[PDB]
Design a protein around this motif. Sequence first.
Motif, PDB file in Angstrom:
ATOM      1  N   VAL A 170       0.858  -1.176   0.000  1.00 32.27           N
ATOM      2  CA  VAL A 170       0.000   0.000   0.000  1.00 32.27           C
ATOM      3  C   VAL A 170       0.897   1.229   0.000  1.00 32.27           C
ATOM      4  O   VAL A 170       1.902   1.276   0.718  1.00 32.27           O
ATOM      5  N   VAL A 171       0.553   2.209  -0.828  1.00 33.58           N
ATOM      6  CA  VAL A 171       1.344   3.429  -0.935  1.00 33.58           C
ATOM      7  C   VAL A 171       1.053   4.312   0.270  1.00 33.58           C
ATOM      8  O   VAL A 171      -0.105   4.641   0.545  1.00 33.58           O
ATOM      9  N   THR A 172       2.105   4.705   0.987  1.00 32.17           N
ATOM     10  CA  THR A 172       1.967   5.562   2.154  1.00 32.17           C
ATOM     11  C   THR A 172       2.577   6.942   1.975  1.00 32.17           C
ATOM     12  O   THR A 172       2.348   7.811   2.826  1.00 32.17           O
ATOM     13  N   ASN A 173       3.344   7.170   0.911  1.00 34.84           N
ATOM     14  CA  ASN A 173       3.885   8.500   0.663  1.00 34.84           C
ATOM     15  C   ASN A 173       4.330   8.600  -0.788  1.00 34.84           C
ATOM     16  O   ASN A 173       4.552   7.591  -1.463  1.00 34.84           O
TER      17      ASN A 173
ATOM     18  N   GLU B 116       4.162   0.262   2.454  1.00 39.14           N
ATOM     19  CA  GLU B 116       4.106  -0.664   3.570  1.00 39.14           C
ATOM     20  C   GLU B 116       3.538  -1.995   3.091  1.00 39.14           C
ATOM     21  O   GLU B 116       2.760  -2.026   2.133  1.00 39.14           O
TER      22      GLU B 116
ATOM     23  N   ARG C 108       5.637  14.707  -7.994  1.00 39.35           N
ATOM     24  CA  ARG C 108       4.596  14.251  -7.077  1.00 39.35           C
ATOM     25  C   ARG C 108       3.221  14.300  -7.734  1.00 39.35           C
ATOM     26  O   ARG C 108       2.416  13.373  -7.573  1.00 39.35           O
TER      27      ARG C 108
ATOM     28  N   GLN D 246       0.770  11.188  -8.131  1.00 46.19           N
ATOM     29  CA  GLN D 246      -0.516  11.211  -7.442  1.00 46.19           C
ATOM     30  C   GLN D 246      -1.664  10.913  -8.397  1.00 46.19           C
ATOM     31  O   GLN D 246      -2.623  10.225  -8.029  1.00 46.19           O
TER      32      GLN D 246
ATOM     33  N   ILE E 226      -1.802   8.170  -2.746  1.00 54.12           N
ATOM     34  CA  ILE E 226      -1.549   7.560  -1.451  1.00 54.12           C
ATOM     35  C   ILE E 226      -2.778   6.765  -1.034  1.00 54.12           C
ATOM     36  O   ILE E 226      -3.920   7.193  -1.242  1.00 54.12           O
ATOM     37  N   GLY E 227      -2.548   5.574  -0.489  1.00 52.78           N
ATOM     38  CA  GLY E 227      -3.615   4.646  -0.190  1.00 52.78           C
ATOM     39  C   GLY E 227      -3.852   3.597  -1.255  1.00 52.78           C
ATOM     40  O   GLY E 227      -4.655   2.685  -1.027  1.00 52.78           O
TER      41      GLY E 227
ATOM     42  N   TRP F 187      -9.018   6.028   5.177  1.00 53.11           N
ATOM     43  CA  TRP F 187      -8.502   7.295   4.671  1.00 53.11           C
ATOM     44  C   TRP F 187      -9.412   7.878   3.598  1.00 53.11           C
ATOM     45  O   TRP F 187     -10.159   7.164   2.922  1.00 53.11           O
TER      46      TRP F 187
ATOM     47  N   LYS G  62      -0.933  15.480   5.892  1.00 49.84           N
ATOM     48  CA  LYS G  62      -1.518  14.227   6.352  1.00 49.84           C
ATOM     49  C   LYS G  62      -1.873  14.346   7.827  1.00 49.84           C
ATOM     50  O   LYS G  62      -1.016  14.689   8.645  1.00 49.84           O
TER      51      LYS G  62
ATOM     52  N   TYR H 257      -6.561  10.451   7.695  1.00 50.92           N
ATOM     53  CA  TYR H 257      -6.608   9.081   8.181  1.00 50.92           C
ATOM     54  C   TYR H 257      -7.493   9.002   9.416  1.00 50.92           C
ATOM     55  O   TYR H 257      -7.460   9.887  10.276  1.00 50.92           O
TER      56      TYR H 257
ATOM     57  N   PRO I 133       2.740   7.250   7.916  1.00 47.10           N
ATOM     58  CA  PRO I 133       3.373   8.546   8.174  1.00 47.10           C
ATOM     59  C   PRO I 133       2.350   9.661   8.059  1.00 47.10           C
ATOM     60  O   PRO I 133       1.466   9.634   7.198  1.00 47.10           O
TER      61      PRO I 133
END
Lengths: 306, 311
Positions: free
Chosen positions: A67-70, A80, A136, A140, A145-146, B47, B54, B190, B206
């Motif tokens: 899963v994309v977190t950043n 993650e 970015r 995106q 993200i997510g 989310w 964030k 989130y 994060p």
Amino acid sequence: MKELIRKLTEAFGPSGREEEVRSIILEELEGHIDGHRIDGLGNLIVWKGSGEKKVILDAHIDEIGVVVTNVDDKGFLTIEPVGGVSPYMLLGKRIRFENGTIGVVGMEGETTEERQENVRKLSFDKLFIDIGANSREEAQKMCPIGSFGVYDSGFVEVSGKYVSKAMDDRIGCAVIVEVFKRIKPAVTLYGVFSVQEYGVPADEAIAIDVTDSADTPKAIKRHAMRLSGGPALKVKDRASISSKRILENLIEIAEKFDIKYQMEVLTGIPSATVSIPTRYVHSPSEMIAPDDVEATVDLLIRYLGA
Amino acid sequence: MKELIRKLTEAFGPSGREEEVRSIILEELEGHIDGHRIDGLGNLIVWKGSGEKKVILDAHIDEIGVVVTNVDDKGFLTIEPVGGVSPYMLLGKRIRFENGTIGVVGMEGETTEERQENVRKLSFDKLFIDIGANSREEAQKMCPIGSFGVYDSGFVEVSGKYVSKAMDDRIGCAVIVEVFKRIKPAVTLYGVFSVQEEVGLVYGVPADEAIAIDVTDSADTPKAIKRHAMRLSGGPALKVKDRASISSKRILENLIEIAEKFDIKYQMEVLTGIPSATVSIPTRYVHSPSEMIAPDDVEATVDLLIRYLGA
């Protein structure tokens, strides 16, 4: 079962985004089931037959992934794990996202020494995914993200073995579908394809899972599960009397119908577990023997059919 | 918001067995989130939005309760507390178990002397639960050792106040859910619905800020004569932490300005990793079967978070 297994294992279905797996299951089952429903959480339930005893066959439809977190300023993704993905299994591998986007997993470190240091204690914070973006905003738009990704690998035959991603637990889904395709049920048979992160009363529940096949070089453990040893029937310790009776019933069916089986040894609704031995679980190249899968289908048809 | 609070507070989710709460949260969020997952610890993460900043909103989903520790020859159950349950809150109370079984809490002592002695130094080993069984075997099948139970009390309106079990911290879960239902996010938002770790033992995302949504004791009952007291209908309580970082103090100041700018009631609470702040719902009778909140405090808290996080 080859084409059924190809479609199910190659389908996109990480946690929360299993729409394609559900559609394939329903398309394969059309003309073979009496009805179905998808509950609020996304569990797919199908049913067939009218016998007095109600039996659930359960397999989970999620597959492991990331899963994309950043996203950084140059468009590289931070991830993650989702499920038991080892970071060592991702190095240099390609990842597939929901909209067809493919990404390449890289590891941080420019000098040969820093890279040697990072691989000795490899962590997800040293990994990134490159989706070909240059900023970015570009990344995106492609992969917010997510976003969930899965292994970008597919089904292949390897000298009579089947190899794909997500044998855990798409091979269990395939077994249940094939049971419904062939069975003339003596029970009321429910198939539960669970999201595994029900509303059906039942007398028994049989989970169809995978178990590690410990028959590769330098495996010296006795009573190890092995490819072509047949369905693995799971010994439970704290099992109720009714759960142990299901297990004994399956053993009796196997011996009476001459189906090979193996016992997976100890380390509300009564339940048993039947597992497909699988090599390289949680890798992009999980491997099964089709005769084990066919034996598992036969076992269930003879236990539940008439 | 009343039905959301009813469903969340009445849901079965003692520490250790919170599955049903997680399912209710997800069903209520269907259509209002972009994704969700459960991490290794069992925390539910959701989310929505895509802004560069964030922000995490955090609430815990477990409630206090009891656990069956023994079954005697006559079918009576022995229990121990899960979380901060006082034995004094259990006297004459009904307990609901996971499978639906209802039990009655009694206290040992026949003589009026030992009953009075027992109740003046009340401990859990003087309590038992009666589930209507007549033997150990009957009781084992209905409520095996290890079974969890919660207050068999539900949601009720008390002249404009809301009263239920488990306001701590299902009202915080409700605030987060309602924020997600309403918000057009200016941030990447989130929601983390967490399980508390047992005392003596021991997120993946994060983020720039984390805001915990908790309850705090409402000290506006008779003979409560302490300054710095939070009160029902005084608005969300913004926590002034003693050792707060520069970044955490910046969040607190942000929330104050948002509240002042949009005419949102609030009160400052002073005690007697990711930069964080705490926003609390004033609650009377915490850890009792009849925890009480004022709906206007909950509405003001949702309003504050939306003004701070939404565009």
